[PDB]
């Protein structure tokens, strides 16, 4: 039990900060995640043998796509770690366990295509799961991996603790469907502003955990500008591949996905910051004040894109 994961000094210090980038060394990402579980949760909350085997099976079931890959999973898990560590006392033992795993597993077996493309292609997954298509698949994949021999990291939880954590993970992964984000945030905005928000109301927690998941998922817009700008290439590589596939189905894609309209990206980023990312981190900061650094970094990156449009870069 007395085996700690230890990171070089720079990573040890910077991993605590919201804007940490996990770096280009793939083989350090597992250690970085176990490190975050040990500090967030405890060295006893998982059997290392089972955790390690769970992490490497999850890694294996992420695909070699430009953005929705293993690096994305660990990046989203790290943002969640930063939130839990800046909000120590507000979350239960089970919520800390469930949510880091939820974040690691939230895009399992992503193919690089939106729910929309699956529906218009008429993919079997779109028949199995009529809404939040990929997110139901992601949870399904999470459950399948937990059930491989020697992979059940929740074994030593009671039957009711176990049912609770799988329920936390299911809602967390479903909430990463950005189509559900708009309504979730509207409701949390209303409840905060009437003083009706109660963290003892489970269905209020559910919504707050929902908004944290959107925050962690979108967290590439909260990094130092050079990280944010370079992730955007990966994001748009997937978008333009989906646009190509739309044109193959005979559908003109939205401009976001059309690689012909590559000139419109800077304005498209402003819309996304203004319509999605700024509202998301604003409402998160209202509910969880210590997550303000995510709103601040997001605002800095909005300004960086405004400079791109104004020809200053
Ligand atoms: C038209 S809309 O409903 O506003 C809508 C639907 C889907 C994607 C975007 N969108 C546009 C521009 C971006 O930069 C991102 C972005 C930034 C960080 N993560 N993501 C992201 C988020 C996802 F959910 C999926 C894939 C992603 F790259 N997302 C907008
Ligand atoms: Cl601590
Ligand atoms: Mg997803
Ligand atoms: Zn994601």
UniProtKB/Swiss-Prot annotation:
The active site is at 68 (proton donor). 3',5'-cyclic GMP binds at residues 68, 269. The keyword Metal-binding applies. This is cAMP and cAMP-inhibited cGMP 3',5'-cyclic phosphodiesterase 10A. Belongs to the cyclic nucleotide phosphodiesterase family. It comes from Homo sapiens (Human). The tandem GAF domains bind cAMP, and regulate enzyme activity. The binding of cAMP stimulates enzyme activity. A divalent metal cation 2 binds at residue 107. Plays a role in signal transduction by regulating the intracellular concentration of cyclic nucleotides. Can hydrolyze both cAMP and cGMP, but has higher affinity for cAMP and is more efficient with cAMP as substrate. May play a critical role in regulating cAMP and cGMP levels in the striatum, a region of the brain that contributes to the control of movement and cognition. It comes from the Eukaryota. It is found in: Cytoplasm, Cytosol. One of its GO terms (biological process) is regulation of cAMP/PKA signal transduction. 3',5'-cyclic AMP binds at residues 68, 269.
């Amino acid at each position: 039990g007395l085996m700690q994961f230890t990171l070089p000094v720079r990573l040890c210090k910077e991993i605590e900060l919201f804007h940490f980038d996990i770096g280009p060394f793939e083989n350090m990402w597992p250690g970085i995640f176990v490190y975050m579980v040990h500090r967030s949760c405890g060295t006893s909350c998982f059997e290392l043998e089972k955790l390690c085997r769970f992490i490497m099976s999850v890694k294996k079931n992420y695909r070699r796509v430009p953005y929705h890959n293993w690096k994305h999973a660990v990046t989203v898990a790290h943002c969640m770690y930063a939130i839990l560590q800046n909000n120590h006392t507000l979350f239960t033992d089970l919520e800390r366990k469930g949510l880091l795993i939820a974040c690691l597993c939230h895009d399992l077996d992503h193919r690089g295509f939106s729910n929309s493309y699956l529906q218009k292609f008429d993919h079997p997954l779109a028949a199995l799961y009529s809404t939040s298509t990929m997110e139901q698949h992601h949870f399904s994949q999470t459950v399948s991996i937990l059930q491989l021999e020697g992979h059940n990291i929740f074994s030593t939880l009671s039957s009711s603790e176990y049912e609770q954590v799988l329920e936390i993970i299911r809602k967390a992964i479903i909430a990463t469907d950005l189509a559900l984000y708009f309504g979730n945030r509207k409701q949390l905005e209303e409840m905060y502003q009437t003083g009706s928000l109660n963290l003892n109301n489970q269905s209020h927690r559910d919504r707050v955990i929902g908004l944290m998941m959107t925050a962690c998922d979108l967290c590439s817009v909260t990094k130092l500008w050079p990280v944010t700008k370079l992730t955007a290439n990966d994001i748009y590589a997937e978008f333009w591949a989906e646009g190509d596939e739309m044109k193959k189905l005979g559908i003109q894609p939205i401009p976001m996905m059309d690689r012909d309209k590559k000139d419109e990206v800077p304005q498209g980023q402003l819309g996304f910051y203004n319509a999605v990312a700024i509202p998301c981190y604003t409402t998160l900061t209202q509910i969880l004040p210590p997550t303000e650094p995510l709103l601040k970094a997001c605002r800095d990156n909005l300004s960086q894109w405004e400079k791109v449009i104004r020809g200053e870069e």
